[PDB]
Amino acid sequence: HHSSGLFRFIGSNNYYMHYKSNRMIDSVLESARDMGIKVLRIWGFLDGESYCRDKNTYMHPEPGVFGVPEGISNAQNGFERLDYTIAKAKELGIKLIIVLVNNWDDFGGMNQYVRWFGGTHHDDFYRDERIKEEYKKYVSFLINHVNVYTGVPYREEPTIMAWELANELRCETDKSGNTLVEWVKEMSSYIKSLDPNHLVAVGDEGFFSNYEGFKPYGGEAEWAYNGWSGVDWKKLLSIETVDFGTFHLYPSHWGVSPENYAQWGAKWIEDHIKIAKEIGKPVVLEEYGIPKSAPVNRTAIYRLWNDLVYDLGGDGAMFWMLAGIGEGSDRDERGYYPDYDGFRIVNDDSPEAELIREYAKLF
């Protein structure tokens, strides 16, 4: 059946949909619907006992333990919070991309898996049979989970648009790109064996691996073009069990100069759409951001990048990040979840929010 509240799209990201309250979850989704944002990319992970304790929310505190440990009381189950988010998204017509582990250490990530299994390097996550088996166990538990607000397991839920393997996965110990390609083939194929209904994407930042005729604007952030991170986007996007390509865009973090943020991002977008079009798969700019304190006009940079994705036939453009009302120690001078990283947009009268509303109508 249908989602009561309900292709190319404006989307956004929000990482707290699996551990905050109903009021805060409803605020993000209602903002997304009010702004015309069709797709929200969210975290579906919370790995490791310290991380779960810190949020009083449990998903994967130890190997083979899913949800709240027997014997911990008064804790939230992150599956129940993700259930609420998915049921409210269905009501509000918002499609979700759910990411299954983090490359980074926030919410435990790959390093939490490596610690549980006694490895010594982040990239052991891609290599050690015992770690791969635990990731598969967690993904199988999640995809088969029956949503307590709908009755429908996630495998059969149409409000979920895609599973994503890993947020910003890198493998700096194999700059040929092959270790990541092999792991993405195994895990995208495994998810397709579990779930014949949903799209699968990788979730990588879109780095290239020294391709003829592709060089960075201005010679800056050359590592994003030359394969340093062990991401070879062309090889990833060619995997049969990957349905669309993802790329992210953060010139301020990547070493680009502020006077070059706009043009570097523009060339980056042009290069990714050109490659995706020749391969013949959809491409989504799934995270982009410029810090609020940048000495250039953020709204005009975001206008340029959205215009490019729209004019060149990209399938989606998703800003990092959308927040709504805050509570507790996460509330700012106006009652919103705070802008901790400089990227937050809320449904207000800021020029960025107005621009997003404008482009949500165009896409």
GROMACS .gro file of N, CA and C in nm, residues 134-219:
model
  258
  134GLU      N    1   2.998  -0.997   1.102
  134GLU     CA    2   2.915  -0.920   1.197
  134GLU      C    3   2.839  -0.809   1.128
  135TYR      N    4   2.899  -0.741   1.031
  135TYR     CA    5   2.826  -0.640   0.951
  135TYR      C    6   2.709  -0.707   0.881
  136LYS      N    7   2.731  -0.823   0.820
  136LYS     CA    8   2.619  -0.892   0.750
  136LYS      C    9   2.511  -0.928   0.850
  137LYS      N   10   2.547  -0.973   0.968
  137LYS     CA   11   2.446  -1.009   1.073
  137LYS      C   12   2.363  -0.886   1.112
  138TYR      N   13   2.430  -0.770   1.128
  138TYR     CA   14   2.360  -0.651   1.167
  138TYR      C   15   2.270  -0.608   1.055
  139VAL      N   16   2.320  -0.605   0.931
  139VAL     CA   17   2.236  -0.562   0.816
  139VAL      C   18   2.114  -0.653   0.799
  140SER      N   19   2.137  -0.785   0.811
  140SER     CA   20   2.023  -0.878   0.803
  140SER      C   21   1.921  -0.852   0.914
  141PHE      N   22   1.966  -0.828   1.038
  141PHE     CA   23   1.871  -0.796   1.146
  141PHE      C   24   1.792  -0.671   1.114
  142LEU      N   25   1.858  -0.568   1.062
  142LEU     CA   26   1.791  -0.445   1.039
  142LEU      C   27   1.692  -0.462   0.925
  143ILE      N   28   1.736  -0.518   0.814
  143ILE     CA   29   1.645  -0.523   0.694
  143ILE      C   30   1.522  -0.609   0.723
  144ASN      N   31   1.539  -0.711   0.810
  144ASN     CA   32   1.425  -0.792   0.842
  144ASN      C   33   1.340  -0.744   0.958
  145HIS      N   34   1.376  -0.631   1.016
  145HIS     CA   35   1.308  -0.582   1.136
  145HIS      C   36   1.164  -0.537   1.106
  146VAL      N   37   1.067  -0.579   1.188
  146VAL     CA   38   0.928  -0.543   1.163
  146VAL      C   39   0.903  -0.413   1.236
  147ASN      N   40   0.860  -0.310   1.161
  147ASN     CA   41   0.838  -0.178   1.220
  147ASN      C   42   0.719  -0.182   1.315
  148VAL      N   43   0.739  -0.141   1.438
  148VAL     CA   44   0.635  -0.158   1.541
  148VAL      C   45   0.520  -0.060   1.522
  149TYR      N   46   0.533   0.035   1.431
  149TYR     CA   47   0.426   0.136   1.409
  149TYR      C   48   0.352   0.104   1.281
  150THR      N   49   0.405   0.014   1.197
  150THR     CA   50   0.338  -0.019   1.068
  150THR      C   51   0.310  -0.164   1.047
  151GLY      N   52   0.381  -0.254   1.114
  151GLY     CA   53   0.365  -0.394   1.083
  151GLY      C   54   0.446  -0.446   0.968
  152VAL      N   55   0.513  -0.355   0.895
  152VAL     CA   56   0.580  -0.393   0.769
  152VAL      C   57   0.732  -0.399   0.797
  153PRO      N   58   0.795  -0.514   0.763
  153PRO     CA   59   0.942  -0.516   0.778
  153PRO      C   60   1.006  -0.416   0.686
  154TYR      N   61   1.125  -0.371   0.722
  154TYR     CA   62   1.191  -0.270   0.642
  154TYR      C   63   1.211  -0.317   0.497
  155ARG      N   64   1.236  -0.448   0.479
  155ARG     CA   65   1.256  -0.514   0.344
  155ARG      C   66   1.138  -0.478   0.253
  156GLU      N   67   1.017  -0.463   0.310
  156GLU     CA   68   0.899  -0.446   0.224
  156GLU      C   69   0.842  -0.303   0.236
  157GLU      N   70   0.917  -0.209   0.296
  157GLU     CA   71   0.865  -0.075   0.321
  157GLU      C   72   0.893   0.022   0.206
  158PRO      N   73   0.787   0.071   0.138
  158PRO     CA   74   0.814   0.158   0.024
  158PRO      C   75   0.865   0.300   0.058
  159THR      N   76   0.850   0.345   0.183
  159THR     CA   77   0.903   0.477   0.216
  159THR      C   78   1.054   0.475   0.218
  160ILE      N   79   1.115   0.359   0.233
  160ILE     CA   80   1.262   0.349   0.222
  160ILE      C   81   1.295   0.345   0.074
  161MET      N   82   1.374   0.442   0.022
  161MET     CA   83   1.415   0.439  -0.117
  161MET      C   84   1.539   0.351  -0.140
  162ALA      N   85   1.638   0.355  -0.049
  162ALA     CA   86   1.762   0.286  -0.077
  162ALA      C   87   1.830   0.250   0.056
  163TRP      N   88   1.899   0.135   0.052
  163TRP     CA   89   2.003   0.107   0.151
  163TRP      C   90   2.134   0.160   0.108
  164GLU      N   91   2.213   0.214   0.203
  164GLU     CA   92   2.344   0.257   0.164
  164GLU      C   93   2.446   0.183   0.251
  165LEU      N   94   2.553   0.130   0.187
  165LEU     CA   95   2.645   0.044   0.257
  165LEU      C   96   2.720   0.114   0.373
  166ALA      N   97   2.770   0.235   0.348
  166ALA     CA   98   2.863   0.295   0.445
  166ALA      C   99   2.877   0.441   0.421
  167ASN      N  100   2.869   0.520   0.524
  167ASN     CA  101   2.890   0.662   0.506
  167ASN      C  102   3.039   0.698   0.479
  168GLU      N  103   3.071   0.750   0.359
  168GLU     CA  104   3.208   0.804   0.332
  168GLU      C  105   3.317   0.700   0.351
  169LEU      N  106   3.292   0.577   0.313
  169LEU     CA  107   3.392   0.470   0.327
  169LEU      C  108   3.523   0.507   0.252
  170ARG      N  109   3.635   0.486   0.323
  170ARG     CA  110   3.768   0.504   0.260
  170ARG      C  111   3.851   0.381   0.294
  171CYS      N  112   3.954   0.360   0.216
  171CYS     CA  113   4.047   0.248   0.244
  171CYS      C  114   4.188   0.296   0.200
  172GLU      N  115   4.245   0.379   0.283
  172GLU     CA  116   4.374   0.444   0.245
  172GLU      C  117   4.487   0.341   0.230
  173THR      N  118   4.472   0.223   0.294
  173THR     CA  119   4.575   0.117   0.280
  173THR      C  120   4.573   0.045   0.147
  174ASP      N  121   4.474   0.076   0.057
  174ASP     CA  122   4.479   0.013  -0.075
  174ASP      C  123   4.441   0.115  -0.178
  175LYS      N  124   4.540   0.190  -0.224
  175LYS     CA  125   4.511   0.301  -0.313
  175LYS      C  126   4.481   0.257  -0.457
  176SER      N  127   4.489   0.125  -0.483
  176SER     CA  128   4.444   0.077  -0.615
  176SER      C  129   4.291   0.084  -0.626
  177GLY      N  130   4.222   0.088  -0.511
  177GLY     CA  131   4.076   0.090  -0.509
  177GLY      C  132   4.016  -0.051  -0.500
  178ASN      N  133   4.097  -0.156  -0.514
  178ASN     CA  134   4.039  -0.288  -0.530
  178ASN      C  135   3.977  -0.342  -0.404
  179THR      N  136   4.039  -0.314  -0.287
  179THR     CA  137   3.981  -0.369  -0.164
  179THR      C  138   3.840  -0.317  -0.145
  180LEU      N  139   3.820  -0.186  -0.163
  180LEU     CA  140   3.683  -0.130  -0.150
  180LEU      C  141   3.589  -0.189  -0.254
  181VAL      N  142   3.633  -0.204  -0.378
  181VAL     CA  143   3.546  -0.257  -0.483
  181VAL      C  144   3.499  -0.399  -0.445
  182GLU      N  145   3.592  -0.480  -0.399
  182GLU     CA  146   3.558  -0.617  -0.359
  182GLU      C  147   3.461  -0.618  -0.244
  183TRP      N  148   3.481  -0.532  -0.146
  183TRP     CA  149   3.389  -0.533  -0.033
  183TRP      C  150   3.250  -0.482  -0.080
  184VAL      N  151   3.248  -0.376  -0.162
  184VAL     CA  152   3.117  -0.324  -0.210
  184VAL      C  153   3.046  -0.431  -0.293
  185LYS      N  154   3.120  -0.506  -0.379
  185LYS     CA  155   3.055  -0.612  -0.454
  185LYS      C  156   2.993  -0.713  -0.358
  186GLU      N  157   3.066  -0.754  -0.253
  186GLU     CA  158   3.016  -0.859  -0.167
  186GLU      C  159   2.893  -0.804  -0.089
  187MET      N  160   2.903  -0.684  -0.034
  187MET     CA  161   2.796  -0.642   0.052
  187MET      C  162   2.671  -0.593  -0.025
  188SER      N  163   2.689  -0.524  -0.140
  188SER     CA  164   2.572  -0.488  -0.226
  188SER      C  165   2.501  -0.616  -0.276
  189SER      N  166   2.579  -0.719  -0.315
  189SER     CA  167   2.520  -0.845  -0.359
  189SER      C  168   2.446  -0.911  -0.240
  190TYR      N  169   2.500  -0.902  -0.117
  190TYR     CA  170   2.437  -0.964  -0.002
  190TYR      C  171   2.305  -0.892   0.028
  191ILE      N  172   2.305  -0.760   0.024
  191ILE     CA  173   2.179  -0.690   0.051
  191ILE      C  174   2.075  -0.720  -0.054
  192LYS      N  175   2.117  -0.726  -0.181
  192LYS     CA  176   2.018  -0.765  -0.289
  192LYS      C  177   1.963  -0.907  -0.264
  193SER      N  178   2.043  -0.996  -0.203
  193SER     CA  179   1.993  -1.133  -0.173
  193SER      C  180   1.887  -1.130  -0.061
  194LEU      N  181   1.895  -1.030   0.026
  194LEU     CA  182   1.803  -1.015   0.142
  194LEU      C  183   1.681  -0.942   0.102
  195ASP      N  184   1.694  -0.849   0.010
  195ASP     CA  185   1.588  -0.753  -0.018
  195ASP      C  186   1.588  -0.727  -0.168
  196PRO      N  187   1.488  -0.785  -0.238
  196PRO     CA  188   1.471  -0.772  -0.379
  196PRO      C  189   1.395  -0.644  -0.417
  197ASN      N  190   1.358  -0.564  -0.319
  197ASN     CA  191   1.268  -0.449  -0.347
  197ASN      C  192   1.347  -0.314  -0.359
  198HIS      N  193   1.450  -0.292  -0.275
  198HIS     CA  194   1.507  -0.162  -0.264
  198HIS      C  195   1.636  -0.142  -0.347
  199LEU      N  196   1.656  -0.015  -0.381
  199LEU     CA  197   1.783   0.028  -0.441
  199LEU      C  198   1.896   0.012  -0.336
  200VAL      N  199   2.017  -0.010  -0.389
  200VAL     CA  200   2.141  -0.014  -0.305
  200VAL      C  201   2.240   0.086  -0.360
  201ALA      N  202   2.292   0.174  -0.271
  201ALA     CA  203   2.402   0.268  -0.307
  201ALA      C  204   2.515   0.250  -0.211
  202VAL      N  205   2.632   0.304  -0.250
  202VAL     CA  206   2.750   0.282  -0.169
  202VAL      C  207   2.759   0.382  -0.053
  203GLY      N  208   2.747   0.513  -0.082
  203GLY     CA  209   2.759   0.610   0.023
  203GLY      C  210   2.896   0.678   0.028
  204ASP      N  211   2.980   0.646  -0.066
  204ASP     CA  212   3.115   0.708  -0.075
  204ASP      C  213   3.110   0.852  -0.120
  205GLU      N  214   3.224   0.921  -0.093
  205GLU     CA  215   3.237   1.065  -0.127
  205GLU      C  216   3.259   1.092  -0.279
  206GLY      N  217   3.287   0.985  -0.358
  206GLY     CA  218   3.294   1.001  -0.506
  206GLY      C  219   3.436   1.028  -0.553
  207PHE      N  220   3.540   1.001  -0.470
  207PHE     CA  221   3.675   1.032  -0.519
  207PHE      C  222   3.712   0.956  -0.644
  208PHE      N  223   3.799   1.019  -0.726
  208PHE     CA  224   3.850   0.952  -0.846
  208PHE      C  225   3.988   0.897  -0.817
  209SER      N  226   4.037   0.816  -0.909
  209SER     CA  227   4.162   0.745  -0.890
  209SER      C  228   4.253   0.767  -1.013
  210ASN      N  229   4.282   0.893  -1.039
  210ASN     CA  230   4.380   0.934  -1.144
  210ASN      C  231   4.328   0.893  -1.283
  211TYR      N  232   4.220   0.956  -1.328
  211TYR     CA  233   4.159   0.922  -1.458
  211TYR      C  234   4.212   1.018  -1.563
  212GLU      N  235   4.244   0.967  -1.682
  212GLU     CA  236   4.292   1.060  -1.787
  212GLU      C  237   4.188   1.173  -1.815
  213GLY      N  238   4.232   1.299  -1.813
  213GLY     CA  239   4.142   1.408  -1.850
  213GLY      C  240   4.056   1.460  -1.735
  214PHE      N  241   4.081   1.410  -1.615
  214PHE     CA  242   4.014   1.460  -1.497
  214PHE      C  243   4.112   1.509  -1.395
  215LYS      N  244   4.120   1.642  -1.383
  215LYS     CA  245   4.217   1.707  -1.291
  215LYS      C  246   4.137   1.809  -1.206
  216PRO      N  247   4.182   1.835  -1.084
  216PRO     CA  248   4.110   1.928  -1.000
  216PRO      C  249   4.114   2.071  -1.044
  217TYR      N  250   4.006   2.144  -1.025
  217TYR     CA  251   4.010   2.287  -1.049
  217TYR      C  252   4.124   2.357  -0.966
  218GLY      N  253   4.210   2.435  -1.035
  218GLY     CA  254   4.305   2.516  -0.958
  218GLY      C  255   4.421   2.437  -0.895
  219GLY      N  256   4.427   2.307  -0.926
  219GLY     CA  257   4.527   2.219  -0.868
  219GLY      C  258   4.508   2.189  -0.721
   0.00000   0.00000   0.00000
